[PDB]
Amino acid sequence: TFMRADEYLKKRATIGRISTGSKSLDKLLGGGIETQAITEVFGEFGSGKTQLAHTLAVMVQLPPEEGGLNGSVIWIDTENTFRPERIREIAQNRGLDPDEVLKHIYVARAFNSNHQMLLVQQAEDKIKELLNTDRPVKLLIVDSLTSHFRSEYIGRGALAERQQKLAKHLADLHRLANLYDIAVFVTNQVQGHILAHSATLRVYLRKGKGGKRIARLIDAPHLPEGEAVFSITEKGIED
Amino acid sequence: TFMRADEYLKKRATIGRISTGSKSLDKLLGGGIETQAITEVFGEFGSGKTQLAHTLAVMVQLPPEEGGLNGSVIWIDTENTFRPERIREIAQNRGLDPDEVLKHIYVARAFNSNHQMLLVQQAEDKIKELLNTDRPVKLLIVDSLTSHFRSEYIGRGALAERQQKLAKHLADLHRLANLYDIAVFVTNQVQGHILAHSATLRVYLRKGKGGKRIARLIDAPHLPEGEAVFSITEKGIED
Amino acid sequence: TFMRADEYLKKRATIGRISTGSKSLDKLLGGGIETQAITEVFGEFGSGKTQLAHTLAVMVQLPPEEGGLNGSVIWIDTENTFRPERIREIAQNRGLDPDEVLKHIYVARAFNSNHQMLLVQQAEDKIKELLNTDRPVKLLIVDSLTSHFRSEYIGRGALAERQQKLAKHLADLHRLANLYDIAVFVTNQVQGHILAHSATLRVYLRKGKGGKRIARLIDAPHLPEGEAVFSITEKGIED
Amino acid sequence: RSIEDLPGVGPATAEKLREAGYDTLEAIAVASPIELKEVAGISEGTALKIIQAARKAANLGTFMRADEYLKKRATIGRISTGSKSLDKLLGGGIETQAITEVFGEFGSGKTQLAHTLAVMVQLPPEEGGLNGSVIWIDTENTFRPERIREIAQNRGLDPDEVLKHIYVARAFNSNHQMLLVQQAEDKIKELLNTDRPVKLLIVDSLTSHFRSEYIGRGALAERQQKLAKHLADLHRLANLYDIAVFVTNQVQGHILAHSATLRVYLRKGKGGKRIARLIDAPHLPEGEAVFSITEKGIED
């Protein structure tokens, strides 16, 4: 049903923040990507958004002081790009036991749109289970979020239904995000260019100067403006 | 459902690799085509992707140290291009008893899209048999994968429906690939339009100089950036 | 289901070949039209593809050594162009009892697409009898194959189910061709530009210099690259 | 030969050539006899002699030895925008011998930036200027010498003096606009070899008239040609006299200065502040710059 504004001030009071792993990008994200929100990162292939995903899957695991939220991770992989080996590197390269971090990340390969949507639907059960333990789910990744949709739905007279589903999908994520104080991170490859409008926050990133990346926000409401540069290394993302 | 990352590390560790029979190819591919993955090879007619298929139908049969995986083969033929005789000219041609190789390959002629798609619904029962044996299924070929789809879906506003089916087909293959550590090899003639949007790895090959086809990849993650030349001879693909 | 590559090598080994009646063309076909295959002949009206059909209905009846396969014939006529008179003529005029030939040919008039598809369904029943006799069915003709489809399905948004229908029909023929080592011959008048895509071999023929019709293949895989001239006379087709 | 000191050209001829856009040695250098014959009246044969004279005389039709070119660049001045932030983004400020295009939505403050620059350029090098004069081509009737007075008397500058080193011309349409460029060279050489030569040439707006007079897919072609030339006319002045050319372009038809040495995009930001960003990577940083509009024009 509904909820009293005071108790809402309460809910939002508990909004946690995961660090991206680079001082710079955090300043821009005003601390990191937040829970109870869908953060969409989009850019060309190789703009490093899947690295950012991997880094986040580590950070969220460390203590609040360290910039995490002592939480687990649910990862829906649609492009077969999730590399547990990579988590190990970033993790053993950040004061975290490599093989333990992997015990707090749960993946699922999504083979098409219906699968994907059906997977986020199932994540709930997993979320619910770990909700009571010391390390609940705090990060839910969908990478890629748009991949399948922009391939199974071609030509108008399809585009309409795509949105009617992509919107049911995004709504499914928003729910989980708020219902369980989870931060939902989604990627979107960009060169028909569909997007995650509901995105509580959309961050655009591109390949920058010398093997570095650079990201910028999209709009003006809530959060600064300008650009942030960082790089891909062990530890994942670093200033 | 979901898998804990550590398990996933285990899973991905048991990934086998079939040799193409080529020095550059296998190296370019990083040891060749892997299991638990769909490898798509595409190019103009005569670019030799059906030869590559035949070669792979042999290699996979020989021991690991020789570039194989001691496994059987399930072959879905849609263009009536499977030549068991051609297997021999390679088997009993690069060392091996031809009468035995052709005892570990099982074909089915697919006469149209629906037929093709149903051959996977049943390509399982056969993999479920050789499963607990000395030579389980390790290679599943679909040649051609797109042929029928791009011919039965032309109608005003069919493109959409094509995908919703080509995508349910690919998903069916993905499942088998992972559920049974099988390497899935699919061909796609190119040059309206279509390609296995999903897949795990897409390799493009074209005809070259003195009858030598030269391939190349379409990405960079987990795979290098260069070209590979080879030739068609007895033994199938040489180098 | 599937078939062991070896046994498929056995099954394929028994591929018979019907002679077109004319030496030249039969060279281009490397012996002629094969069984376990769909051969499509297409050309303008009067390019003589219905004659070729009639000749074939005779040849197939004579012994292998002469360019036949001692078999019966199933004829699906859609344009009311089957003339036993013509058979009778060719029969005797070749060196065979015309009264005998007219005993191993079974026709059905197809009045529209559904009828047509429905008959190829029932031809299985006739392929069953002859199968145990001395003269099993070895030739199945569909003339015209496309006539009705390109008249009942006018305009995209129909063009769609035309292929669903066409592709299903062709699949029904492919099955029979392989399931019973039958050679399937189909005609297609050309000049909405339809065509049997799953055809095992497509031969194009046009009217030539004077009373002589020329032929040419459509591809490269299997059989030579050149044109073949022949004529229409008693005996049907001859160099 | 510098100007129309060309063989067959007398003042009457020069008159017809100018009123037609053939105002430079390169303009004539690239023309055809037929065109000049029909523009000036001269015969096809003398016009030809004229063309050759120009091809051979052309200033911007000669190559410069890279050692020479390296030095020319060594003498490039820089005007401050009046904002540490923005200047960082420009690597010091807008440069001379270049066309800097600033574009954005109406009200994104690009006309303010123009006014500020018209002051800055007047103060000493250490102050952020080049002790120079200003030529201002106004097409939208947006030049307020009053804003100049202000911004000046707010940086401890004698407004009555600053107002003495800015020269404006109202351009009523494309042809007028383009025409005033050549007449700008007149004043530029006039104030040239003076305590305060011309160091800043503003064209605000640069595109306004072009996107209003050329509507159509048949008008698009020559729209570009004329802009192309106009821009070329500015480039010439920019290099020929170490002048910094600043042009504005309202955006969001569509047009722009494709040959602009540097394009800066700016939009309305936060609250009363504007944010400018560069459109490329070669030469200069790659981030955003925030600033505001106040007395002194642009600040921060």
Place this chain on the structure above:
Amino acid sequence: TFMRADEYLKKRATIGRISTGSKSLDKLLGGGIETQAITEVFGEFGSGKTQLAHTLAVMVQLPPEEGGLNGSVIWIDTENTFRPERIREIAQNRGLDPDEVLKHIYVARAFNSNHQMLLVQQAEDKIKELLNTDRPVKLLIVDSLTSHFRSEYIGRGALAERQQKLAKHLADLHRLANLYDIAVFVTNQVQGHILAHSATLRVYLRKGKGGKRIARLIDAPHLPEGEAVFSITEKGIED
């Protein structure tokens, strides 16, 4: 006129070659970019074709065994991208006297199409002068060659006028190239579709792997068919 093949056989022998400063590229180019020819390099912004230009402006100055032809350079700059400073640097970091190098490169800024076309015709004057010198012009650069043309010609029926002019220009360069054994290097930013349909050789290059660039030839006649990788550093381009 119609030079006699004998003489033609000769002239074609008197062709010099500039080294790109990268043994890898040079192999693909077979020595390097040749004189009496227009070599067009095209790729996305930042694919380093302007660097390649700068390097060539150095190489051509050093001795034949060094990989040059002891010649001067004419540079038509249309995008204000010629940095003598960027050149000066290349020579020193390559053992050459930076202040000497810059005495054999002559530039001209082209402000629009007409200007550009002008400059080339006027480049002849210079080429002539330097013709009888210990260091004649051997390299003529046009960067960018297409920039202005694709901006000034976008209206109605403009596309045709763009090719007539583009072609008169290219022909003006071809003449100089042959009339004076000069190598003509032109750049073309890609991604209308404007190109040098007349360039003797077209090389495509893109940004690759880790801060590098991969070169390929768009063709198949003369020279290899493999890609070439290199990098941008002091010395400009490296093998």
Place this chain on the structure above:
Amino acid sequence: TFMRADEYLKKRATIGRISTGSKSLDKLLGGGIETQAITEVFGEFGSGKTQLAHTLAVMVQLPPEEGGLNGSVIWIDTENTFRPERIREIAQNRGLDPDEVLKHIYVARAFNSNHQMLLVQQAEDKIKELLNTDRPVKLLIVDSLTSHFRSEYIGRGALAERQQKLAKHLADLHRLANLYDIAVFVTNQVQGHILAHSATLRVYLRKGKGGKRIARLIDAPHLPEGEAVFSITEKGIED
């Protein structure tokens, strides 16, 4: 003006024939390419039409009894594809002094359409000399004939004067062909679909099975109906 049908019968009686170098093809051409005619060969890039051109430039030089006509050659090159090297090779490697051949071939590089048309204008001057010598011009090549036209004329409303231009050019060649009993050979790459309509004979050729290019005629009036296979080797073209 005109010519008495008899004298035209005399003029036509002296129609010479150049051999393509390969027996087979020469059969399809009923002796080869004739004089007083424009023979157009067209096909995809690499279909070997430029080789055929080179071979012809040799054959025409040898005596009639061997498949030539003791004549010189005028070559208009538009794609910079004329290789005296290749001539030299074929020359000697056939049984003739390569140094002599390279004395009866005269080339001109055409840099654009106007240039091209302009040269065919001037070739009359060269056809004049050789006319009185022992080796008059008997072969005039235009390779490529269409290259420049399909690049300078882009879009209908240009397509118009393209033909005005093309048709006028072709007319200029037709005149020379008849006015001087010269055989005019032209190439046309195919795959805006232009083509020499007034061509006396159009031969289409494509790449074949392996290292062998196949040919076929385009019509029926004069010469047979069939395909011809041949290969590229030293001697140029051969069966």
